[PDB]
Design a binder for this molecule. Structure first.
Ligand SMILES: Cc1cc2nc3c(=O)[nH]c(=O)nc-3n(C[C@H](O)[C@H](O)[C@H](O)COP(=O)(O)OP(=O)(O)OC[C@H]3O[C@@H](n4cnc5c(N)ncnc54)[C@H](O)[C@@H]3O)c2cc1C
Ligand SMILES: O=c1[nH]c(=O)c2[nH]c(=O)[nH]c2[nH]1
Ligand code: FES
Ligand code: FES
Ligand SMILES: [Ca+2]
Ligand SMILES: [Ca+2]
Lengths: 1289, 48, 49, 49
């Protein structure tokens, strides 16, 4: 019954009944209505919830500012703090410099990540008004963006730092920063800094939270109820409560207690209070490292190196050093350092106090320490290094499970003074078992041993034995893990030789081979470069004609201010309910019973919906082969059984946990091979076949056969699937607000499930916080359920999926297995090709057949192959249904093509770029599906890219690096692409528009396309503006709805600008003919006068417009007819540097030349090249879904699914749009852009393969030429293929 | 499935109107409505 | 729509005079389909200006 | 007849919805010499005039 009192954007908040379970994010969004701050993940990985906190420090007498994830900060931790959200720093009437600069430099596409990025950059500026470039990049470690490819954001914000074609933006015009104009620190809170802190108690529905003010209250409370759970930053507790369904009915938060926050410089080391945030720990160790001598700071630098690639600023501000120690994760990056270096931990309870050096006994079991229930960790002393004491820290380049199988390590060695002989040796690892462990058997054997080659090999055999992993140890990747334990030790071994040499003793130890030095360097990324090139518009072009100009996304300012409304930002009706889906926990099983008894006891529970509750038809899906709600049978982990309806999402979630399902297992089919074995496919084989296969294989000088596996991909749109259904109570009328690319099918699935005509259902889309194909169809499984719930209750109902749910239910890109056989000449000329493709389609057909069709249309990629056969089968399996993903079959087929091509080059002993170029098609050639290639721009893109990337010179530098470097290598590839434009279903190539002109002259324009970040609405306004001859400022697009434009295709296949551009254009032409007579009568008199004369002459000022792509329609029977209206073209050359000992790598440089016709909008089109390119880069190098052997997706968030981060992008990133290439086939001579560039990220994959080849030639022994690199080429896969003395034994 | 547009606006203006007070000419109306009513009542002369 | 159902709208509003009923009557005679296939749901400035 | 026809005020209020009431002159023709809003502000839930 203590009040909770804090400030948000300067305004005082008083909460009389604070619930310990309420996060700041919910409070902002739902109690205060401030929806600028977003939910993207709820686990601290994405930063979309980033806000700033300010408070008066008593341990410093100064006002401080830091950022935090709203999604993990309990409001109960926030008493007497001041919050600032995106709405608090500025709005569209007065943008903050940070908000203006991200908007104007095109760093906001869908807009969903923009406020959290703004808050990270804003916070940085409040702490460092003159930051460096390195600081600007670092501010975003905990901030993910899926659309931009990051370059524009950094480029925009670089203007805060260092204290041919036109440009994309003008930094000269940015308003200057005046720091005096920031919001005041609430004067009330500086008065309240006087009254001493008093203990607080908060009581919620289930939890009590005690905010303790002194050590005495804390140890007192732990003496009396040892169950009381310590919460400091909540960065681990918050996860345990939200994702692992742990409840802790009593919580104590000690963050206020001064002794838990002290920093004391002493003789042996520096003591940190346990509640000290890692950001302070970082800060004081940095200061110490910088000012003290090298020799005293070895452990310090070890800590710091682990903190480098350890979560973002938001997390570190609140994550405590104590918290990490006590959580005792097997994958803690800190605990191996603390162990290896024997850190002094002080423990207290009421009346007791003891000191321990951290060692192997400190961690007895899984997630346990040697703390007695009633004890708390008080402080940890990080030791100075002694003379002749050396320290390294290391960590596995990736992370695939929640808790295990990630190698991380601290390594320490002390020398007998004046010698090369080992006095102490400590090698401590995580991710190698269920606790942080020491190599205690191995290390004692090395006592007295000289630091030499015999030590190295003896330590390696020791670790291989003492840390052996069973082939089925939890978390897999056992070969890769084993190798890293060895490889990390080797680096420490060379690092130690190097450091011995610095202390004069290079005569006793042996000199380091100069080709080995690169193995020991700590990660350094040079400064980013970046160039963007595009074509200026004709000099004569009216300045009001924006077509071809880099106009920013119309909503960028609104996105940067948090004012743009997304679906869950829409206010709830008073009587609004929430829905949570209930999904199968088994891949294939009969449902034997459902028990809702525990669900019914949850307060605010309304009902549980199941197949029986559907009014008309439980049969849905694109091909009618899916259930709304499962009946009798579940077919995948994630199959939707029903839906809990309740007042609040929290109650829906608890009620859903209270639905008990009983199953009887059925024979499951999971993998592509499982389904091959079972003749389990969606329909029959698909085939394209040209010329004479036996003749081409006969002609051939060489024949290569092989397999390739390509893993899937989660879209990770920063906004998950979301629907609000609002029942109107008359005649079955309902209106839905949905995050979808497909209003038509949403509408029509809702109507069929309810058995009401389509004319009763309206689907409205304002914008989506990203789509990528994931909301092309799959959004409907959320929509139908919601719509059902609202019909039953006659109340509005909403649901927005949490990340875990979304990744699980909605499926991904199709995994592909290919088996190929290619026949070619000694010259590199390929003459024969057979590829059988397989995809994993999961449990409904959905778009799987069209996707395979697309793959097959692209199995040629850029190359004429006169004798060719491709076959496709789509496997039917007990997995979530896989769906459209930007590329849609293209990147899979085209990667397979480039993979056998890579083997063509290597086998012929010829240069890849020559073999590629001489197999390339030429103008007027026919494809394997007999479509003639007109306006073939690919050779121009190719020649411009060889020249601008300076490819031939760069090939020589790569060779040189490689001869001079043993444990790092470089690789370089140049990869082309042809991408057919148009939906494979011909009739989907249509679109419509509706325009109105009001009597004030303003225009309200709508079209069937939806805005998902790609700037479609922007382009359409540009179009209508040119076509009407009026400024963009008179034309507005407010949303997309089924009751303004009907029967629209999904926003997809990159075609929506093509299709709706024509529609819009036609509707504008119709307006213009009706205005002509008013124009002639009054030829100069402004637009408004013509409109009013037309009005008062009773002429109609409303028109539709419509368009269909002419001349389309391929048949597989005959292999004839054009499937595509035209083709996109592009070329990327990429350079990488791989670390052969860990499998990590740097993307050094990428050059893209892309043909987008005469771009409608070069800023958005460059935007789309980078974004798509960087998703490609994820597909091929980072993103990996992992499933249980039983078909249960395990990677269900950012913690284990790693999309590209700010730091993954090419150091130098160049993109040029092809000049003078108007495309007569499309609106104002432009080309579609959305999907073609994604596959060019291929060039990074092949660069990696090139560098692995070099590593493999270095470290022998004999064979295999033509080794396996499956996609994604993760660190695991890269490290394993770098066969050396560590992988063998 | 043959990509024909299923949406249309329709529009109508009543033709040939425009009356002039100045010239007492032109038609204010497109047509006239007509009708007739017979009503019977009984009053109370003392109360109204 | 593709199920054959018609959503119709016009600039008049309903105030009890049965206007939408009449307009559903007209539309059904004009299209030669029954009145049950045609719905009017509301009047709005963003469908008829 | 069933009361399910929705008229404007039957529409569910949003949870953040406010209400408005007009203040009107009580004089046929007059200068406004002042407006004092002090009592209005003491009413619970008052937002603005
Ligand atoms: C996005 C993200 C990325 C992360 N990345 C990494 C990473 O790369 N490497 C890594 O090692 N960790 C990582 N973590 C974990 C992070 O380091 C820990 O979550 C954090 O240090 C825990 O501190 P806290 O104050 O937030 O603890 P809380 O979540 O508040 O508590 C965690 C545990 O510590 C206990 N506790 C806290 N203080 C004491 C005390 N003094 N005495 C006894 N028990 C105490 C609590 O009871 C609880 O059991 C990451 C977390 C997030 C959200
Ligand atoms: O030819 C396509 N058809 C689609 O339905 C689709 N969806 C998508 O994201 N790309 C494509 N491509
Ligand atoms: S929503 Fe908080 S980190 Fe993703
Ligand atoms: S614009 Fe950053 S997530 Fe879409
Ligand atoms: Ca998805
Ligand atoms: Ca599928």
């Amino acid at each position: 019954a203590d009040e909770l009192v804090f400030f948000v954007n300067g305004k005082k908040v008083v909460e009389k009944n604070a619930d310990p379970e309420t996060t700041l994010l919910v409070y902002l969004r739902r109690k205060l209505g401030l929806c600028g701050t977003k939910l993207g993940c709820g686990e601290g990985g994405c930063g979309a919830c980033t806000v700033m906190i300010s408070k008066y420090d008593r341990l410093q007498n100064k006002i401080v500012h830091f950022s935090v994830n709203a999604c993990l900060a309990p409001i109960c931790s926030l008493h007497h703090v001041a919050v600032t959200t995106v709405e608090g720093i500025g709005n569209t009437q007065k943008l903050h410099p940070v908000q203006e600069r991200i908007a104007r430099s095109h760093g906001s596409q869908c807009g969903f990540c923009t406020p959290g990025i703004v808050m990270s950059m804003y916070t940085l500026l409040r702490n460092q008004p003159e930051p460096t470039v390195e600081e600007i990049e670092n501010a975003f470690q905990g901030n993910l963006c899926r659309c931009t490819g990051y370059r524009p954001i950094l480029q925009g914000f670089r203007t805060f730092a260092k204290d041919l074609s036109p440009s994309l933006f003008n930094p000269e015009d940015f308003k200057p920063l005046d720091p005096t104009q920031e919001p005041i620190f609430p004067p009330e809170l500086l008065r309240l800094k006087d009254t001493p802190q008093k203990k607080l108690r908060f009581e919620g529905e289930r939890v009590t939270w005690i905010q303790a003010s002194t050590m005495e209250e804390l140890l007192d409370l732990k003496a009396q109820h040892p169950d009381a759970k310590l919460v400091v930053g909540n960065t681990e507790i918050g996860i345990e409560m939200k994702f692992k369904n742990m409840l802790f009915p009593l919580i104590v938060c000690p963050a206020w207690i001064p002794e838990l926050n002290s920093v004391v410089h002493g003789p042996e080391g520096i003591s940190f209070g346990a509640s000290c945030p890692l950001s302070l720990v970082e800060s004081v160790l940095a200061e110490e490292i910088a000012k003290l001598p090298e020799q005293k700071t070895e452990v310090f630098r070890g800590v710091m190196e682990q903190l480098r690639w350890f979560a973002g600023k938001q997390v570190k501000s609140v994550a405590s050093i104590g918290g990490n120690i006590i959580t005792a994760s097997p994958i803690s990056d800190l605990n191996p350092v603390f162990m290896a270096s024997g850190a002094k931990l002080t423990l207290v309870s009421r009346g007791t106090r003891r000191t321990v050096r951290m060692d192997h006994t400190f961690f007895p079991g899984y997630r346990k320490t040697l703390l007695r229930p009633e004890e708390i960790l008080l402080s940890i002393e990080i030791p100075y290094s002694k003379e002749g004491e050396f320290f390294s820290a290391f960590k596995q380049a990736s992370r695939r499970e929640d808790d295990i199988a990630k190698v991380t390590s601290g390594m320490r060695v002390l020398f007998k003074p004046g010698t090369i002989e080992v006095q102490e040796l400590s090698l401590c690892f995580g991710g190698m078992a269920d606790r942080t462990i020491s190599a205690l058997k191995t290390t004692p054997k090395q006592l007295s041993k000289s630091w030499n080659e015999e030590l190295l090999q003896s330590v390696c055999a020791g670790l291989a034995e003492e840390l052996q992993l069973a082939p089925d140890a939890p978390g897999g990747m056992v070969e890769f893990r084993r190798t890293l334990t060895l490889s990390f030790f080797f680096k420490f071994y060379l690092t130690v030789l190097q450091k011995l040499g610095r202390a004069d003793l290079e005569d006793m130890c042996g000199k380091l081979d100069p080709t080995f030095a690169s193995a020991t360097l700590l990660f350094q990324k040079d400064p980013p470069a970046n160039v963007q090139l595009f074509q200026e518009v004709p000099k004569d072009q009216s300045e009001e004609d924006m077509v071809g100009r880099p106009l920013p996304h119309l909503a960028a300012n609104m996105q940067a201010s948090g004012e743009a409304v997304y679906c869950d930002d829409i206010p709830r009706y008073e009587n609004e309910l929430s829905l949570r889906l209930v999904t199968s926990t088994r891949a294939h099983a009969k449902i034997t019973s459902i028990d809702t008894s525990e669900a019914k006891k949850v307060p605010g529970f309304v009902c549980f919906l199941t197949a029986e509750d559907v009014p008309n038809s439980n049969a849905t899906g694109l091909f009618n082969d899916e259930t709304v709600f499962a009946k009798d049978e579940v077919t995948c982990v994630g199959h939707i059984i029903g839906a809990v309806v309740a007042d609040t999402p929290e109650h829906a979630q608890r009620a859903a946990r209270g639905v008990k399902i009983t199953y009887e297992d059925l024979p499951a089919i999971i993998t592509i091979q499982d389904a091959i074995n079972n003749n389990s496919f969606y329909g029959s084989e698909i085939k394209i076949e040209k010329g004479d296969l036996k003749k081409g294989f006969s002609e051939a000088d060489n024949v290569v056969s092989g397999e390739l596996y390509i893993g899937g991909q989660e879209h990770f749109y920063l906004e998950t699937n979301c629907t609000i259904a609002v029942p109107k109570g008359e005649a079955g009328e309902m209106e839905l607000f949905v995050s979808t690319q497909n209003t038509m099918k949403t509408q029509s699935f809702v109507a069929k499930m309810l058995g009401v005509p389509d004319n009763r259902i309206v689907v409205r889309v304002k914008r989506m916080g990203g789509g990528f194909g994931g909301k092309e169809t799959r959004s409907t499984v959320v929509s139908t359920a919601l719509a059902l719930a609202a019909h039953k209750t006659g109340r509005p109902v909403r649901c927005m999926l949490d990340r875990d749910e979304d990744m699980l239910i909605t499926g991904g890109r199709h995994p592909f297995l290919a088996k190929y056989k290619v026949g070619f000449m000694k010259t590199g000329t390929v003459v024969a090709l057979e590829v059988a493709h397989f995809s994993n389609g999961g449990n409904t057909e959905d778009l799987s057949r069209s996707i395979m069709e697309r793959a097959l249309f692209h199995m040629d990629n850029a190359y004429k192959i006169p004798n060719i056969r491709g076959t496709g089968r789509i496997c039917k399996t007990n997995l979530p249904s896989n769906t459209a993903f930007r590329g849609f079959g293209g990147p899979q087929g085209m990667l397979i093509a480039e993979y056998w091509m890579s083997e063509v080059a290597i086998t012929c002993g010829l240069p890849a770029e020559e073999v590629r170029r001489k197999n390339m098609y030429k103008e007027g050639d026919l494809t394997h599906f007999n479509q003639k290639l007109e306006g073939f721009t690919l050779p121009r893109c190719w020649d411009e890219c060889i020249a601008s990337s300076q490819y031939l010179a760069r090939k020589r530098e790569v060779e040189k690096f490689n001869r001079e470097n043993c444990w790092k290598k470089r690789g370089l590839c140049i990869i082309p692409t042809k991408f057919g434009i148009s939906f494979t279903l011909p009739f989907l190539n249509q679109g419509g528009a509706l325009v109105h002109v009001y009597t004030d002259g303003s225009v309200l324009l709508t079209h069937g396309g939806t805005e998902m970040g790609q700037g479609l609405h922007t382009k359409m306004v540009q179009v209508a503006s040119r076509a009407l001859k009026i400024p963009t400022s008179k034309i507005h697009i407010s949303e997309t709805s089924t009751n303004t434009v009907p029967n629209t295709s999904p926003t997809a296949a990159s075609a929506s600008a093509d299709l709706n551009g024509q529609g819009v254009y036609e509707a504008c032409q119709t307006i213009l003919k009706r205005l002509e007579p008013f124009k002639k009568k009054k030829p100069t008199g402004p637009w408004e006068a013509w409109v009013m004369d037309a009005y008062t002459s009773a002429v109609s000022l409303s028109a539709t417009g419509f368009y269909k792509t002419p001349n389309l329609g391929y048949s597989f029977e005959t292999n004839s007819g054009n499937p595509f209206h035209y083709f996109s073209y592009g070329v990327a050359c990429s350079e990488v540097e791989i670390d052969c000992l860990t499998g990590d790598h740097k993307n050094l440089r990428t050059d893209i030349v892309m043909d987008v016709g005469s771009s409608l909008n070069p800023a958005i089109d460059i935007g789309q090249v980078e974004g798509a390119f960087v998703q490609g880069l994820g597909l091929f190098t980072m993103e990996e879904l992992h499933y249980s052997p039983e078909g249960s997706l395990h990677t269900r968030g950012p913690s284990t699914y790693k999309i590209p981060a700010f730091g993954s992008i090419p150091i130098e990133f160049r993109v040029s749009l092809l000049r003078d290439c108007p495309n007569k086939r499309a609106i104002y001579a432009s080309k579609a852009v959305g999907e073609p560039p994604l596959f060019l990220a291929s060039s990074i994959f092949f660069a990696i393969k090139d560098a692995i080849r070099a590593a493999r030639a270095q470290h022998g022994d004999n064979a295999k030429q033509l080794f396996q690199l499956d996609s994604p080429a993760t660190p695991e896969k890269i490290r394993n293929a770098c066969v050396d003395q560590f992988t063998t034994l």
